[PDB]
């Protein structure tokens, strides 16, 4: 039952009476691991932002980045790096805009890149975790660009500088599959897959149309790039479940988060990060509630849990809060987090019994994504 | 009274007696059969007319008469911009004023005079009639009445149900008698969304009464010059066309290059495009708002010669705010835009859609 | 205040969330920062881009044609926030999708969100999106 | 009774029934006037910060600002323009920093002067308007510095340029009574009159001490430059007056704000902008509560208005909510401006009655500074 | 509650506006953001200067003199806000004055304020 | 056996038998009447102290022995920062292992060896009792044991409360004996506020129980060489004093350059000011660290000599991040801290104060 805060104040009264000194210095942040966990705050287009980087077990917030006007965080799957592709102006939100990427330190949350991308070429939009991507390799960030017209961004971290803007036709979305090579989804209901060699025209090939005209997809799917599965549910629960973990898109069974009697009882996925996935336990958790066909951006109170295999629902939790997005640690046991952009708070749930453990309040003004490192 | 008044003005349109060797009409340009615009092939193709004298070669592709009666008169508006008008660079103040000026016009109906055109009027005892019951006793003798009188009747023709029937399939969607194809639903909304809408409306906002996809103002759109048209015109090589600053009592050297916004309507069966006919495909006409938005090679290539669209006629006053909108239209937004504009298409002219 | 349930539009207060031009708005209402229901506030910027979608007016039973416009070049205004989806496709759709910061066209190449404005562009009709 | 929101709705609904055509633009702000008021938002200490342009006599945003870090807004008296001195970053908080003023058309409220200030030279603390000053011509920002000592900028606004660093002894805030001259209050308990050219040594006079070493002078004095008035609280409602309008300092008669019962009974002044002087009133407004001597810069429930002659008090004010700033408009029949940090609302309040008759919430996150032109 | 009331220390939670270390602190509480109650968080910088307050120790009924310290480079940390002002003088003392940014000293001429820590440096006299 | 000991070397501390020429003893140089510095003239004023033999001069400033007790025995800690040790340059580990030194040292007492100062030592009846009763029968007869044994006692007088006795007026203030001026009080505050509490003041945090004004560490602030106090000591033009680096052990290049923080106790007393004894006055050492902190001319002008402070002997491994604190001291915060430092003065030195 001791807080934090408390065990702090004990701490520092024993220090004082025993006479222990101590030299004030810069705290290094724990060594990145799996209950490690990032809420970025878009402040609701607010021209600058806030990371926050929270020891998901302690449910204590272990450092912060600055950010500029909607940046896009990365976080490296193994640990050794965080980055984000972001976007400054020479006075506040007017004048000479800057668009670059900085790569950080774990531990020391220091810098170590920053990378200028030539004539501002970020997607400016409410935070898309996939509109931002790093290869497996962490070698290459890949970036969209939607005016003037969809293209891709790819920028160098190991050489530290961007290298060229890549032609796409009309799609949406960065899935990388491979240091060269990353998916992307398309109007024409295709996944267009998209092979960069150093020069020219990368080499786009098309998927079957996977999904209908008035089928509608949300802008947040789910990607586990170890797995290479694309997890994709549409404004009614349907998901589409894409493996790319041989280079090219096979198209799994497609799947309901929702039963037919749920659907017509007016239960829809709603929300910003509806969907998480878990990579070792092959589970998806989709953020649902009742609600109308076009309240699909409002917060959800409820859970649910699907095998992603079968469909069968494994659980339902009724969150307790006001949930916008969700996302969970990928190691085993893992946490469940729950992001209220209402509250500001993380809420962190243990996954496996939805329960309440602990929770981390006022992460800035909107906080909207999670990110976790696939450590595994 | 305007019934009468209009059918003359129905006898004087397709009547060749109002030119000079008596071998055209106003029909003969403005073709009823298409859209009242010109389907004989020139020495520039159907970029520009062939006039009276079967030589002479206008500098301007011809355009529809169709809901040219919804323009306003010239008027510059409050905003310090100008509207309406009739002829490309809005020379003439309204449909009146206009219809004088071909039969006048030595590269097209080409009559000396007034005179000449009265006297052509005398000889005909049903004009005598028509004319007189309107305008009354002695109107053909006296060449000015006459003159003007007929250019009324034109008017007043042109002002009939007839030019502007509003049976587009466009019109009986907004009547909800029928849908767009989902295609026509995209092209329309692109064409709202994206920098179309910004000229090709009537109004900033609400809804048009009717609608005919021009704000009716002048903008320079940056159009190269049309080298065979230009040479068949014979003004010269030289010949630069200053669009709205041609027309008398327009000073102002930012109206230099600008022209008249078309009406939309009908535009899918108007082909050859823009105000010097440089455009055969209507594909084309959309493709070319690409060269201010997309950084793509071939947004700088027109498709027709496979070569730089070519250097503006004027470098100057182009509408950079509304072009350079920072958004390319991609191979499916150009059709879903063909599309919709083809839904512009009178009753009567969706047969010459193929 | 129940935010799931199907949103009611008024047509007597343009300040308020639900007033029935703002059926796919995303961000903040100008007419809280000093613009006003179709115009920008002082120093900003209009962007020419716009999303669209067709919002039922209560008043006339019409549904509308609501070309919405962004005013950018300043930090978000925090006044009238507002935040609704009437027909709001995903991002692939983008003439009918909101999370864009639809700035394009904007002067002075302005790109930042303050606000946005709700006029009326014509009287249609979706499929997708219809009364 | 009917608010500005529905009159709009009202208005928008007869035009659209009416067919009636408007070009979507840029408004104007209306002309400034007497009851035009300016809110800052340090928010707290946020790199970046807002400014809200109201009309009081509606109640109405007419504009917006947006500044960086701790800016120090001033207002033309004359209504001519606005100006701030900022504080900008290359990567939002951290990198090289670059402090500027920015002068404002205060209809159209674009910048029509970007003046960098060399070397960083800003003293950056929560915000104290008379920290940085506007000659009376119009023509010249001053600004403190802090560090490496106590110094005063001189920007000539009229020439777009940063002129020179004035060397002053130990000494803070900068009141301005000519187009060369400014008063400091010092350390010592003095006032030091500065008298600065292009170049040379600025003339540097004291007055005597006005106080003891043990009377405590707030950081947010009044100041009418127009009226050459400085009226100075300390920690006790004890008022300093100061009349500078010779040009050179008279002591005032010392007036309390507070009976000496209220003062026995715990009453304090506390707020931020505790004290506002209208000048053709010749009235003093205290922010007071009954507060501990240490919670001097808590919120207060209550205003004096007390007569600047005399010191004889004329209302006490129960505001109805936590207000930490005051203000007043200059035109007669004054409005007092009451600005909570907590509610982020500017109550607006007839000053003779005290009586609340609007309010503009939604104004940031912890605006404290409220300034008016005394434009009459 | 009441802010208003003679301030109350207390030394139990190190993040409450009622430490009794933190009797003139304004800002944010660094251990809120990843510090410490003496350390800063992680990319901020640490300055030098300081400035002092003497906070009665409900816990040995000593009163310390407690030299702030702030944690800079960074935007303001947004957690655990906190402002008291014991003994808190107007600007003209700044020993004792707390709206100033006190971030001189720092690395890399940070300047921005982030978080500030609460360290004792002695009794007071 | 402790009072036996600290009283033979309170014997030997003023015994002239241990130089050379029999001149010279601990209290020659570290003369108790000036808080155990040297009051001497040499050629470079009171810089630089004057051996046994009457001509030879050293290169460093004769330091107080008040309070050096206080000091650890050198070492480096955890932050690979060094501490503590004896010289300004921490080259002795301890009092012990410095007491021996200036005994042996040609510069100053100049005895040949250990077995000469023995000898000296077997003369006085005195001692043979002294010594034996506390190191056993025929400690004189071996030189080693002689002087390790001299060495001892030396140090342990060293530790007695004559030497430390904490009971200048800040002591006083610090038990509620007494108050601070106005001066005085703000000398203090601005003295923990400034960056001098960063390396004066034993801790980084909490509360030091026997306060001596530094933190035992070695820092290089810039100074410059004093040419009269090298040019009677005869190093040379071309030599540095490497400070720490000069420790036998020490091969760190970081460490060129950097001297032990002296102890502020009785610095109003012990002038001139410095390793080198560079600064005659006490204001002069205060005002120095404005050359880094400063914008103006003055700043860069040491005010004794109307010259600049000069180039510091070892331009490397300044302590800027200290020293660099973006905050310049005024002419009121330099009279504030020299009244708080003279604070720092034992009682029976609170006379020295007036000259
Ligand atoms: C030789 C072919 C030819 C003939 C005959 C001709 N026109 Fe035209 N018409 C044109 C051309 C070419 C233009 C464009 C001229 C310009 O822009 O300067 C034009 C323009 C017009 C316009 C303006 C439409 C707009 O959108 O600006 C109207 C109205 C018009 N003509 C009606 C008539 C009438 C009535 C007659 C019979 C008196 C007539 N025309 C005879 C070819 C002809
Ligand atoms: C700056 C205002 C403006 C914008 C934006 C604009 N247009 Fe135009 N449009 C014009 C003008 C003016 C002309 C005639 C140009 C000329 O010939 O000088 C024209 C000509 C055309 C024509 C040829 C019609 C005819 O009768 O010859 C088509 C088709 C057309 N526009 C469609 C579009 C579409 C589709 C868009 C959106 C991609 C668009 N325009 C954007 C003003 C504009
Ligand atoms: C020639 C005059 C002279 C004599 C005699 C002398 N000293 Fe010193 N003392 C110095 C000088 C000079 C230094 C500093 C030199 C250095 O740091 O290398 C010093 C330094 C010291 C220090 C280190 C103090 C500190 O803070 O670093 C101690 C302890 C000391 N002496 C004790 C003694 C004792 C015990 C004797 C008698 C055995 C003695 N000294 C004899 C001049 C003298
Ligand atoms: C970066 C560490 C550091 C800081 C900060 C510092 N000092 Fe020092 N001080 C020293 C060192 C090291 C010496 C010895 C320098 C030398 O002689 O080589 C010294 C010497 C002195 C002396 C001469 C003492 C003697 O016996 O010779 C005085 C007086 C002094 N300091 C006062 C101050 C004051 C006052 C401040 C605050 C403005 C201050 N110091 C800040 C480390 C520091
Ligand atoms: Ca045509
Ligand atoms: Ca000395």
Do not use: I, Q, V
């Given at each position: 039952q001791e807080t934090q805060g408390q065990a702090a104040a004990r701490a520092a009264a024993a220090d004082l009476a025993a006479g222990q000194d101590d030299e004030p210095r810069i705290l290094e942040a724990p060594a990145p691991d799996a209950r490690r966990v990032y809420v970025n705050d878009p402040a609701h287009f607010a021209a600058v932002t806030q990371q926050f980087v929270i020891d998901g077990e302690a449910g204590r917030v272990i450092g912060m980045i600055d950010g500029g006007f909607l940046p896009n965080p990365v976080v490296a799957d193994d640990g050794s790096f965080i980055a984000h592709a972001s976007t400054v102006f020479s006075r506040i939100a007017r004048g000479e805009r800057t668009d670059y990427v900085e790569v950080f330190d774990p531990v020391t949350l220091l810098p170590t890149a920053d990378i200028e991308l030539p004539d501002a070429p970020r997607f400016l939009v409410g935070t898309y975790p996939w509109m931002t991507s790093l290869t497996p390799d962490g070698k290459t960030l890949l970036f969209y660009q939607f005016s003037p017209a969809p293209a891709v961004g790819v920028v160098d971290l190991e050489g530290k500088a961007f290298k060229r803007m890549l032609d796409v036709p009309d799609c949406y979305h960065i899935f990388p599959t491979a240091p060269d090579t990353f998916f992307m989804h398309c109007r024409d209901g295709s996944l267009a897959k998209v092979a960069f060699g150093t020069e020219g025209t990368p080499e786009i090939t098309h998927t079957e149309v996977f999904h209908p005209e008035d089928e509608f997809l949300i802008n947040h799917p789910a990607y586990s790039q170890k797995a290479g599965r694309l997890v994709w549910p549409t404004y009614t629960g349907k998901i589409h479940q894409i493996d790319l973990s041989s280079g090219d898109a096979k198209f799994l069974p497609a799947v309901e988060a929702l039963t037919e009697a749920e659907r017509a009882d007016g239960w829809r996925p709603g929300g910003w990060q509806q969907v998480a996935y878990h990579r070792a336990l092959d589970r998806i958790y989709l953020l649902v509630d009742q609600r109308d066909e076009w309240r699909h951006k409002t917060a959800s109170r409820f859970v649910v849990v699907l095998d992603a295999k079968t469909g069968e629902r494994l659980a339902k939790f009724e969150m307790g809060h006001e949930i916008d997005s969700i996302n969970v640690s990928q190691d085993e046991k893992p946490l469940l987090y729950a992001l209220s952009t209402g509250d500001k708070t993380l809420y962190i749930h243990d996954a496996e019994s939805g329960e309440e453990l602990r929770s981390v309040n006022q992460l800035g003004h909107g906080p909207q994504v999670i990110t976790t490192a696939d450590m595994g | 009274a305007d019934d009468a008044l209009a059918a003359l003005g129905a006898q004087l349109f397709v009547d060749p007696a109002l030119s000079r060797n008596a071998t055209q009409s106003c029909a003969t340009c403005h073709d009823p059969a298409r859209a009242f615009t010109d389907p004989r092939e020139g020495k520039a193709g159907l970029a520009v007319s062939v006039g009276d004298d079967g030589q002479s070669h206008g500098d301007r592709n011809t355009p529809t008469?169709?809901?040219?009666?919804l323009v306003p008169a010239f008027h510059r508006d409050a905003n310090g911009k100008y509207k309406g008008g009739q002829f490309w660079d809005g020379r003439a103040d309204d449909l009146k004023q206009q219809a004088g000026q071909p039969m006048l016009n030595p590269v097209e109906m080409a009559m000396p005079d007034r005179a000449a055109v009265a006297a052509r009027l005398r000889d005909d005892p049903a004009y005598r009639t028509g004319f007189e019951a309107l305008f009354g006793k002695g109107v053909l003798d006296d060449p000015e009445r006459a003159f003007d009188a007929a250019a009324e009747a034109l008017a007043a023709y042109q002002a009939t149900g007839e030019f502007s029937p509003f049976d587009s399939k466009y019109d009986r969607v907004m009547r909800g008698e029928e849908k767009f194809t989902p295609l026509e639903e995209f092209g329309y909304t692109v064409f709202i969304t994206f920098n179309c809408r910004l000229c090709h409306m009537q109004r900033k906002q609400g809804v048009a009464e009717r609608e005919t996809f021009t704000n009716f103002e002048y903008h320079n759109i940056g159009l190269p010059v049309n080298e065979t048209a230009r040479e068949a015109s014979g003004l010269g090589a030289d010949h630069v066309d200053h669009g709205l600053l041609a027309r008398p009592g327009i000073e102002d050297p930012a109206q230099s290059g600008r022209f008249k916004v078309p009406s939309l309507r009908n535009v899918a069966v108007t082909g050859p495009y823009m105000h010097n006919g440089v455009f055969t495909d209507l594909r084309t006409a959309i493709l070319f708002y690409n060269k201010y938005t997309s950084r793509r090679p071939e947004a700088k290539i027109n498709p027709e010669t496979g070569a730089p669209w070519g250097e503006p006629e004027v470098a100057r006053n182009l509408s950079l705010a509304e072009l350079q909108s920072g958004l390319m239209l991609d191979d499916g937004r150009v059709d879903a835009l063909v599309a919709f504009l083809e839904t512009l298409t009178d009753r009567r002219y969706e047969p010459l859609l193929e | 205040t129940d935010p799931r349930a199907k949103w009611v539009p008024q047509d007597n207060d343009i300040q308020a969330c639900d007033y029935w031009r703002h059926c796919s708005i995303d961000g903040n209402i100008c007419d809280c920062s000093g613009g006003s229901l179709t115009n920008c506030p002082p120093g900003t910027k209009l962007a020419t881009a716009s999303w669209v979608a067709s919002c039922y007016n209560p008043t006339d039973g019409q549904s509308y044609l609501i070309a919405y416009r962004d005013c950018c070049g300043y930090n978000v205004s925090g006044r009238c926030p507002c935040l609704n989806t009437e027909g709001e496709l995903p991002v692939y759709r983008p003439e009918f999708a909101n999370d864009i910061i639809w700035c394009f066209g904007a002067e002075d190449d302005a790109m930042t969100y303050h606000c946005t404005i709700s006029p009326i562009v014509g009287k249609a009709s979706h499929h997708h999106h219809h009364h």
């Open positions: - | 008469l169709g809901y040219a009666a | -």
